[PDB]
UniProtKB/Swiss-Prot annotation:
Domain of life: Eukaryota
Record remark on domains: The SAP domain is required for nuclear targeting. The SP-RING-type zinc finger mediates interaction with UBC9 and CDC3 and is required for E3 activity.
Post-translational modification: Phosphorylated in early M-phase. Autosumoylated upon ethanol stress.
Subunit and interaction comment: Interacts with UBC9 and CDC3.
Record's function text: Acts as an E3 ligase mediating SUMO/Smt3 attachment to septins and PCNA. May be involved in chromosome maintenance.
Location in or out of the cell: Cytoplasm; Nucleus; Bud neck
Family in the record: Belongs to the PIAS family.
ZnF bounds (SP-RING-type): 186-267
Anything else known: Present with 149 molecules/cell in log phase SD medium.
PINIT domain: residues covered: 4-156
Full-sequence portion shown in this chain: 159 to 444 of 904
Protein's UniProt name: E3 SUMO-protein ligase SIZ1
Length: 280
């Protein structure tokens, strides 16, 4: 069922499913055979799939230090939101098996997300190159339909992403100075700023914040990213606002003080001027 006389995607039929992305993994290839459907049943039900890894595929996954993995995703055919921004959601309760082994809902990070809300790592249970693989999802008591996909994804590392932040135009000193003055105006002067990260409670090494952040206090981009990988909130640790990876930049002002202060100083006194002095 679909409109024969149209013009664009806006007017067609069945928006293609696209799982909400994470900067920690990148969907690279779809293993075609690994596509199952979960039906509506008041009892038990299951879907299986058999697939053999091609030459090109088995590779990325093989190597001992390979940043590639085979993830199984699940989403609803009729989600609350949009299929174009599909939430990862497996039916509950369920039991996933790969080549007769049960797959614990444990992957790299995302430890804050229950198992039904994150992809499943099939990789450590694949059979050798030339040898069919079997995946089986056992579910029960489903009121909605779900569709699963098998994707070879590339693990993106916290330090790799840090590189993207360092390669992003920093927040130049002039900006910080203008803010520091706008700040110091509303009074009843100097402000005390910490060189410590709110995330690590340790000396910062990569001072940062969203360019959208209205505050002097930065946080360590490395810790922020290691924190997001485990507990994906994507919220500033200081002002709690929503921040996107692309808007994360190093603060040149804070970086300067940090790269020119005694390894044991934990705070710095700032004057309307813009100059600073370590608080020993
Ligand atoms: Zn902020």
């Amino acid at each position: 069922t679909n409109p024969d006389a149209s013009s664009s995607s806006s007017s067609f039929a069945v928006p293609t499913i696209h799982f909400k992305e994470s900067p920690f993994y990148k969907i690279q290839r779809l293993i075609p055979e690994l596509v199952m459907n979960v039906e509506v049943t008041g009892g038990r039900g299951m879907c299986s799939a058999k697939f053999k890894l091609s030459k090109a595929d088995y590779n990325l996954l093989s190597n001992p230090n390979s940043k590639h993995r085979l993830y199984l995703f699940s989403g609803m055919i009729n989600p609350l939101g949009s299929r174009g921004n599909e939430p990862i959601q497996f039916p509950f309760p369920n039991e996933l098996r790969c080549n007769n082994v049960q797959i614990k809902d444990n992957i790299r990070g995302f430890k804050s997300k229950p198992g039904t809300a994150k992809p499943a790592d099939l990789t450590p249970h694949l059979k050798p190159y030339t040898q069919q693989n079997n995946v089986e999802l056992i579910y029960a008591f489903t009121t909605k339909e779900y569709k699963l996909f098998g994707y070879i994804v590339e693990m993106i590392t916290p330090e790799q992403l840090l590189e993207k932040v360092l390669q992003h135009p920093k927040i130049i000193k002039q900006a910080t100075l203008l803010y520091l003055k706008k700040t110091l105006r509303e009074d009843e002067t100097s402000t005390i700023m910490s060189l410590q990260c709110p995330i690590s409670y340790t000396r910062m090494k990569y001072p940062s914040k969203s360019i959208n952040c209205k505050h002097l206090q930065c946080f360590d981009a490395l810790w922020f990213l290691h924190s997001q990988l485990q507990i994906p909130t994507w919220q500033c640790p200081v002002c709690q606002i929503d921040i996107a990876l692309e808007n994360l930049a190093i603060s040149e002002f804070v970086d300067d003080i940090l790269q020119n202060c005694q390894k044991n100083v934990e705070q710095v006194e700032l004057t309307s001027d813009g100059k600073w002095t370590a608080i020993l």
